Amino acid sequence: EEAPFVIVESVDPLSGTCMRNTVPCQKRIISENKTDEEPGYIKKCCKGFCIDILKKISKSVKFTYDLYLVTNGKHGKKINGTWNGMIGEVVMKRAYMAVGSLTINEERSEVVDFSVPFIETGISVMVSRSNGTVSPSAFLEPFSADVWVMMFVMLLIVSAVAVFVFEYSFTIGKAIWLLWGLVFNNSVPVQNPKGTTSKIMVSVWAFFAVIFLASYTANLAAFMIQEEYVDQVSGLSDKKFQRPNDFSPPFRFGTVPNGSTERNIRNNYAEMHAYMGKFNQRGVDDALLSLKTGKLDAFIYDAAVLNYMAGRDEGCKLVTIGSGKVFASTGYGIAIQKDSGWKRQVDLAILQLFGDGEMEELEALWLTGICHNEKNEVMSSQLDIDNMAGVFYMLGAAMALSLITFICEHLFYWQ
C-alpha cells in the first residue's frame, strides 16, 4: 500500500463487503511470538491506479488473479546477499508477480525480469516557497547607461549655452546646480535668473525632466508587476549541497531510508550519505508536515509521488525546483518471475494502451491536481534591506569620493 497508487480502506460494515470498482486484497496480521495462533486473515479491498491498470490487462489477456498485501518489508533492501519485501517475495516463487510502485535499476533487474515502463519519474527535490522576489538591483532595470550619459551631456551643453546667454550674479556652479536640482522633482531650493531666454530654456528643461520622471516610475512599476520567481538551488551539483557547512548553519534535509533513492545516492556521493546519517525521517506524511514548520529546508524522494503531492496539499505554498528536472530518470514496471512465457504477452498487451489513449484519460482522472508550476509570483513586500542595499552602497561610494575630493582640494589650495 502506497498513497497515490494503491489505496486500502475499510469495507462497508453493514453489507459485509466493500464498494464496487474495487477488488479484494487479503491482509495478513502478525501475532504474539510466544504462541502464534492459526494464520489470521482480514478481508480488505484495494483500489487505485495500478489496480485499475491490472484489471484492464487481466481482462485484455483473460486470466484470473488473487492479490494480497505484503506482511513485512518495504520495496526491498539487500541484506546478507538476500532480499526482503516484495522483491524478496517474488524470488521465493510464492508470489510470481508484483505490481505497484517499484523503481527500475540494475540490481533488481539482475534478479527478476521487468516490463516496459508506463510512467516517467526519477530523483527530484522540493523546497518551501520564500515570500518576496529576487530583485537585487531593480532600480537599475529601467533605462540604460546610454540615456544616463546622454542626459548628462545634454544638461552640460544646455548649461554651457545658458552661461553663454548670461554673458550677453549668475555663476557657473549655480547654473548647473539649478538644473540638477530641478530635474529631480524640483526638490532643492535654488535662485533663478532675470533673463527671459534663460527662463524659456529652463522651462523647456523642466518639461523634459517632468516627462522623464513619470515614465521612469511607470516603467519601474510595470516591471515589478512582472517579476520572476527563481528557486534558490540550481541543482544537485550546487555548492549549497556539496559544501554544506561553510555557508550558514547547515541546511536541514534528509531522505527516507530503505529506498532506491538512498542506494542511488550512496554510490554517486558518500559524504552526502554520511551527512544524512543523522537527519532521517519516518515517512512521507511526517516529512511533508515538518517541511512547513521550518524543521527541514529540503526533501529528496521519487518525483512521481511528489508531483502528485504538490498539487493536492491545501494551498500552493509548496513547489519544486526549476521545471521539475528529474535526475536519473527511470520508470516503474511490473515484476515477473524470471524465464516465464507470460512476460512477452503482458509486455505486448500493456503497450496496446498507448495507441488506444485510454491511459491518458485514466491518468487525467487519477492524477490531476490543482496547483500550477507556472510562476505564480504572488507579490514581494516589506522591502527587506537585502532588496535595496545597492543604493546605500552608492551613497557610501559617493561619501568616499566627496571626502577624498575635499582632501585633494584642500591640498591643492594649501600650496
Binding site: 540494475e106 545634454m154 551643453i157 524640483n186 527671459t196 530654456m201 554517486n268 505486448l348 503497450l351 495507441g355
Partner: protein, 425 residues
C-alpha cells in the same frame, strides 16, 4: 549499423579531400568523436545515386562508442537508402505483406543494430524486441508567433493629437481671465504664474492679491496635478498590458478537431505519427485532411514553416524543443500526449539484447546521460519568454534629444529677437 539523422542525433557533413573531416573543438576544446559514414548523396530522387564516404557525429554516436567499448565489439555504420523510418504497406495486391525502410533493412539480413530515434508502438514491438529507453519524450505542436507592439513615441502613445491643443488653448484662456480680473480690480506675470505651475517648476514671484484670482489659481493647481497623474497612470497601464495570442492548446483545440480551408498542417510521410492517427477510428476526420499534404522529411518542413506556408507541425517533442530554443522565431506550445520513449532495435535472438539492455541502465544511473544532455542539448539560445518586459531603447531618447536642440536654436533666434526688441524701445 543503419541510422538516419533527424535534427540532433546524427549530423551529416561533407569531408575533406584527404578522406575525413577536420575535428571541431568543443566549448572547452575537447575532441569530438566522429566516424566515416557511407551514405547516399543529395536528397531528391532521380539524382546520380552513387554512394560517397562522409563523416558523422552527434548525441547518439558517442553513446554507440561507449556501448561498443563496454561490450568489446567492432562496427561499420552506413546510412539508410530511402531516408524514411518505415512502416507496413501492402504492395502488388498480393497476399503477403512486407515492410520498407529500416524495418526491411533489419528484418532481412541487411543490418544488425538500429541506433536511431526509433519510437516504440504495438506494430514495431511485434517483430522487434526492444531495449529499455534512454530518453523519454512525447508529441508537441510547432507554431509561429507575431511580434507585439513597439514602445512607440514619447508623446504620441498615451495621448492622441486632439488634446494638447485644448490644454494649450485653455492655459492661455485662464491667463487672459486672470489678467482681466487683475485689470478690473502685471499682465506678463500672469503668464509665468500659469506656465510655471503647470510645469512644476518655480519661475518668478507671481503673488496675485485678488481673492477670486487666488481661488482660481488654487482650483487650477489641482487640475494640473490630475493631468500629470492621469498621464502617468495611462502610460503605466499601457506599458504592461499585452495583446493576447491564439496559442493553440493542443489536440483538443477546435481548429485541429475539424478541417478548415485557412488552416493547413502536415507531418512527415510514413512514420509513427501516421500510424497513431490512422489506427484510431475517431481521429479520421483530420487524418483525411492530413494525408493529402504530407511532406518528405523534417529537414524541409521546419524551413517551410518560417516562410509562412504551414500553420502547424506535429512531430517529436525533443527534436522540436531543441530547434525551438535555438531559433527564436518559432515557439512550441501545448501539452505532451502519446508518451513513449525511444529504444535500440534488435532481432529476437541475440545476447547483445541482454548485455546492451543491462549496460544502458548502468550508464543511465550514473549521470553520464545527463553529461551528454548538457553537452549536446541544453546549450540554449534566445528564449525571451512571451511578455518580455522591455527596457526602453533609443526610441524615447531620440525625440527628446532632438527637441532639446530645437529649443536651443529657437532660443538663439529669440535672443536675436531680444536684441531687436531692446533696440526698438
Amino acid at each position: 549499423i543503419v541510422t538516419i539523422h533527424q535534427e540532433p542525433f546524427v549530423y551529416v557533413k561533407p569531408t575533406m579531400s584527404d578522406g575525413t573531416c577536420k575535428e571541431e573543438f568543443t566549448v572547452n576544446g575537447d575532441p569530438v568523436k566522429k566516424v566515416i559514414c557511407t551514405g547516399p548523396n543529395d536528397t531528391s530522387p532521380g539524382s546520380p545515386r552513387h554512394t560517397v564516404p562522409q563523416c558523422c557525429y552527434g548525441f547518439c554516436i558517442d553513446l554507440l562508442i561507449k556501448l561498443a567499448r563496454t561490450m568489446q565489439f567492432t562496427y561499420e555504420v552506413h546510412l539508410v537508402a530511402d531516408g524514411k523510418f518505415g512502416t507496413q504497406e501492402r504492395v502488388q495486391n498480393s497476399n503477403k505483406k512486407e515492410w520498407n525502410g529500416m524495418m526491411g533493412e533489419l528484418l532481412s539480413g541487411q543490418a544488425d543494430m538500429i541506433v536511431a530515434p526509433l519510437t516504440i508502438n504495438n506494430e514495431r514491438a511485434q517483430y522487434i524486441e526492444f531495449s529499455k529507453p534512454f530518453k523519454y519524450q512525447g508529441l508537441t505542436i510547432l507554431v509561429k508567433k507575431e511580434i507585439p507592439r513597439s514602445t512607440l513615441d514619447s508623446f504620441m502613445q498615451p495621448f492622441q493629437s486632439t488634446l494638447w491643443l485644448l490644454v494649450g488653448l485653455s492655459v492661455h484662456v485662464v491667463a487672459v481671465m486672470l489678467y482681466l480680473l487683475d485689470r478690473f480690480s502685471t499682465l506678463s506675470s500672469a503668464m509665468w504664474f500659469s506656465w510655471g505651475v503647470l510645469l512644476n517648476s518655480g519661475i518668478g514671484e507671481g503673488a496675485p492679491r485678488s481673492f477670486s484670482a487666488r481661488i482660481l489659481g488654487m482650483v487650477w493647481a489641482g487640475f494640473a496635478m490630475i493631468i500629470v497623474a492621469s498621464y502617468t497612470a495611462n502610460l503605466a497601464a499601457f506599458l504592461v498590458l499585452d495583446r493576447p495570442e491564439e496559442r493553440i492548446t493542443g489536440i483538443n483545440d477546435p481548429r485541429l478537431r475539424n478541417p478548415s480551408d485557412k488552416f493547413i498542417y502536415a507531418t512527415v510521410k510514413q512514420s509513427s505519427v501516421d500510424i497513431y492517427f490512422r489506427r484510431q477510428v475517431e481521429l479520421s476526420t483530420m487524418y483525411r485532411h492530413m494525408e493529402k499534404h504530407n511532406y518528405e522529411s523534417a529537414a524541409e518542413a521546419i524551413q517551410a514553416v518560417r516562410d509562412n506556408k504551414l500553420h502547424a507541425f506535429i512531430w517529436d517533442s525533443a527534436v522540436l524543443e531543441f530547434e525551438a530554443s535555438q531559433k527564436c522565431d518559432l515557439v512550441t506550445t501545448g501539452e505532451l500526449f502519446f508518451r513513449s520513449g525511444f529504444g535500440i532495435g534488435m532481432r529476437k535472438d541475440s545476447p547483445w539484447k541482454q548485455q546492451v539492455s543491462l549496460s544502458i541502465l548502468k550508464s543511465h544511473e550514473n549521470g553520464f546521460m545527463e553529461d551528454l544532455d548538457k553537452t549536446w542539448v541544453r546549450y540554449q539560445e534566445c528564449d525571451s519568454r512571451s511578455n518580455a518586459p522591455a527596457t526602453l531603447t533609443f526610441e524615447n531618447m531620440a525625440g527628446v534629444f532632438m527637441l532639446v536642440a530645437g529649443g536651443i536654436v529657437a532660443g538663439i533666434f529669440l535672443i536675436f529677437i531680444e536684441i531687436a526688441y531692446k533696440r526698438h524701445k
